[PDB]
C-alpha cells in the first residue's frame, strides 16, 4: 500500500545494521493468478490460455 504508481514498487528494500536472522522477502510462485507475477510478460501470455504448465527461471 502506498507505492503502486511509483518506481519504488520494483525495489526490494535492503536495510542496514545487524539483523542477521530476519526475513527479507517471500512470495508464492504462481504466475497468472498471483498479483506479483500477474502483469509481467510471462503473466500476460498465460492469461490467454486455460491450461498451462512448465518451468520458470528467476
Amino acid at each position: 500500500e502506498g507505492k503502486l504508481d511509483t518506481m519504488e514498487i520494483y525495489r526490494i528494500p535492503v536495510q542496514s545494521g545487524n539483523h542477521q536472522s530476519s526475513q527479507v522477502f517471500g512470495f508464492q510462485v504462481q504466475p497468472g493468478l498471483d498479483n506479483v507475477f500477474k502483469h509481467t510478460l510471462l503473466g500476460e501470455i498465460l492469461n490467454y490460455y486455460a491450461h498451462w504448465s512448465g518451468s520458470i527461471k528467476l
Binding site: L4, F25, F27, Q28
Partner: protein, 222 residues
C-alpha cells in the same frame, strides 16, 4: 503448437451491426455503412497491439435478417428479398443515396443475394502499396498524428434491391471478419491501460499491479 501465430489470430468475430430500411424520410437510414479499420473492434484490437507490422488476407461473411414494420398493413404475400453488398477499394467513389449512379460502377465488387440461401462470403487480398500494415505510427500524415495513408483498406455498403415504391421493411446486417495467412513483426509489450478512443493511444495513468499485505506475505497452505 497452439501458441503459433496462425492459431492465435485466425478466428472470426462480429465487428459491425447496422440497420437499414426499404422506405423512410431520412435517406441515410436506407443503407448500411462501415469503414474498415482495425482499431474499432475491441476483440481483435488488443491481440494485434502485441505486434508492430502485420500482413494478412481478409475473409468476410454476412448474416442478414428482416422484419415487417408494425405500422398498419397486414395480409401481404411478399416474395423473398434481395440484397446488394458492395465493397469499395481504397480510391473508389462513395455513394450518397441509394439511387446513386455509384452503385452501378464496374470497378466496385458487389454481391447479390436473396434470403433463404446460404450466407454470403467474399475474400480480400493484402491491399497496400506498402509492404505491411502498421499498427503503430510515430509521425504525421503530411496533419494528423498517428495516422498514415497506407492503412486504407476500404468500405462496405448494403441496400435493398427492390423496384420502385416498395413495401416498408427493416433489415439488419452482421459482418463477420476473419484474417488468414498472417505474418507479424517486432513484438511490443501489452497495453496496461483501458482504451479511450479508437484513433489514438491516449489513456489515464493506472497502477502497475495489485497490492498485498506485506513483502513477506504468503497465504496459508491447504
Amino acid at each position: 503448437s497452439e501458441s503459433s501465430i496462425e492459431n492465435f489470430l485466425c478466428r472470426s468475430a462480429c465487428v459491425y451491426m447496422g440497420e437499414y430500411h426499404t422506405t423512410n424520410t431520412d435517406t441515410s437510414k436506407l443503407f448500411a455503412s462501415w469503414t474498415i479499420n482495425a482499431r474499432r473492434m475491441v476483440q481483435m484490437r488488443r491481440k494485434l497491439e502485441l505486434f508492430t507490422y502485420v500482413r494478412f488476407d481478409m475473409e468476410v461473411t454476412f448474416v442478414i435478417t428482416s422484419k415487417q414494420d408494425q405500422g398498419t398493413q397486414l395480409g401481404q404475400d411478399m416474395p423473398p428479398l434481395t440484397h446488394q453488398i458492395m465493397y469499395i477499394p481504397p480510391g473508389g467513389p462513395i455513394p450518397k443515396s441509394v439511387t446513386d449512379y455509384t452503385w452501378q460502377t464496374s470497378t466496385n465488387p458487389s454481391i447479390f443475394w436473396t434470403e433463404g440461401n446460404a450466407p454470403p462470403r467474399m475474400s480480400i487480398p493484402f491491399i497496400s502499396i506498402g509492404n505491411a500494415y502498421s499498427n503503430f505510427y510515430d509521425g504525421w500524415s503530411h496533419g494528423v498524428y498517428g495516422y498514415n495513408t497506407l492503412n486504407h483498406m476500404g468500405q462496405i455498403y448494403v441496400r435493398h434491391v427492390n423496384g420502385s415504391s416498395p413495401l416498408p421493411m427493416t433489415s439488419t446486417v452482421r459482418m463477420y471478419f476473419k484474417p488468414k495467412h498472417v505474418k507479424v513483426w517486432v513484438p511490443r509489450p501489452p497495453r496496461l491501460c483501458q482504451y479511450k478512443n479508437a484513433s489514438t493511444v491516449n489513456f489515464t495513468p493506472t497502477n502497475i499491479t495489485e497490492k498485498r499485505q506485506s513483502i513477506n506475505y504468503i497465504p496459508e497452505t491447504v
